[PDB]
Write a protein that binds this ligand. Structure first.
Ligand SMILES: NCCCCCCOP(=O)(O)OP(=O)(O)OC[C@H]1O[C@@H](n2ccc(=O)[nH]c2=O)[C@H](O)[C@@H]1O
Ligand SMILES: CC(=O)N[C@H]1[C@H](O[C@H]2[C@@H](O)[C@H](O)[C@@H](CO)O[C@@H]2O)O[C@H](CO)[C@@H](O)[C@@H]1O
Ligand SMILES: [Mn+2]
Length: 272
């Protein structure tokens, strides 16, 4: 097989995105025949240079996830990516830890295949233009740049939350993500700090291509804003040295290969 072209010729650009109709994953699987068990896909006609593991931090967001799968799968295939979907389900009912789940995702996906790119996506964010590439670049990539919830523009120029993509080397270079941001807030800013402290800059598509929809939702229980977040992001430079991949432990409780995704239920513990 020849290499796929640099930019996919299958893209159609702007798309209509809606969250008011029911979704049946059996039907989605039928509509996405080429997606193999566990949510894996690679083009039949050419070799993609993008071996992407898409990591979703998760707990009790099945409805959002259904929308995510319905919209992203068609888009990811048009982008001609060699990809896999991983939903990192946090076991238990204690305080949520988005970033630690993301680290679990990186480490576990690597056990399945030689992925060299990682897209970290919240479960409720849908891209509105398939020209917004869900793969890696020479610098860390911020993907969800123009979210409807922020008035279709960045909330601040150093905002790196929502959806992003880091190559395997970029992720390893920053010792991954912090493991001690329990509850909502700041871990994305910590991550931005890590990248900057390791000589990188944020790459982004333009605001039109990067237009993204956030599924309106209410606060989840057990993910209360973390009061010590402002203090933690002020010391990233020092803490990133020993907090992240090199200080990570967890216990996978279950791995389920669904037609459209692999769900890893994991026990990431509680504080300290
Ligand atoms: N007015 C309504 C207030 C809603 C504010 C809740 C915070 O909203 P956001 O900043 O979108 O963050 P969030 O969606 O709650 O958390 C980000 C991401 O963590 C994941 N997440 C978080 C909490 C939870 O219980 N389950 C879960 O899966 C999910 O991928 C989510 O998209
Ligand atoms: C540290 C933090 O809370 N970061 C979140 C960021 O916070 C905003 C604002 O709400 C904070 O008061 C100031 C403090 O300097 O920083 C930012 O301007 O908001 C983002 C979007 O909701 C979150 O993703 C960050 O985690
Ligand atoms: Mn949300």
């Amino acid at each position: 097989l020849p290499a796929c072209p640099e930019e996919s010729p299958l893209l159609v650009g702007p798309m209509l995105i809606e969250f008011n109709m029911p979704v049946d994953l059996e039907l989605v699987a039928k509509q996405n025949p080429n997606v193999k068990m566990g949510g894996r896909y690679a083009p039949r006609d050419c070799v993609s240079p993008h071996k992407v593991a898409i990591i979703i931090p998760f707990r009790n967001r099945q409805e959002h996830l259904k929308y995510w799968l319905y919209y992203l799968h068609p888009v990811l295939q048009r982008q001609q990516l060699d990809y896999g979907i991983y939903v990192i389900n946090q076991a238990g009912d204690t305080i949520f830890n988005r970033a630690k789940l993301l680290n679990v995702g990186f480490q576990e996906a690597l056990k399945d295949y030689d992925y060299t790119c990682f897209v970290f996506s919240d479960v409720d964010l849908i891209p509105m233009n398939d020209h917004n590439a869900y793969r890696c670049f020479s610098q860390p990539r911020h993907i969800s740049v123009a979210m409807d919830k922020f008035g279709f523009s960045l909330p601040y120029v150093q905002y790196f939350g929502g959806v992003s993509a880091l190559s395997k080397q970029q992720f390893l270079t920053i010792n991954g993500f912090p493991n001690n941001y329990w509850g909502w807030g700041g871990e994305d800013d910590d991550i931005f700090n890590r990248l900057v402290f390791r000589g990188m800059s944020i790459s982004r598509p333009n605001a039109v291509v990067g237009t993204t929809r956030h599924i309106r939702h209410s606060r989840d229980k057990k993910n209360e804003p973390n009061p010590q977040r402002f203090d933690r992001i002020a010391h990233t430079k020092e803490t990133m040295l020993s907090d992240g991949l090199n200080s990570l432990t967890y216990q996978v409780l279950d791995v389920q290969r669904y037609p459209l995704y692999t769900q890893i239920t994991v026990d990431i513990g509680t504080p300290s």
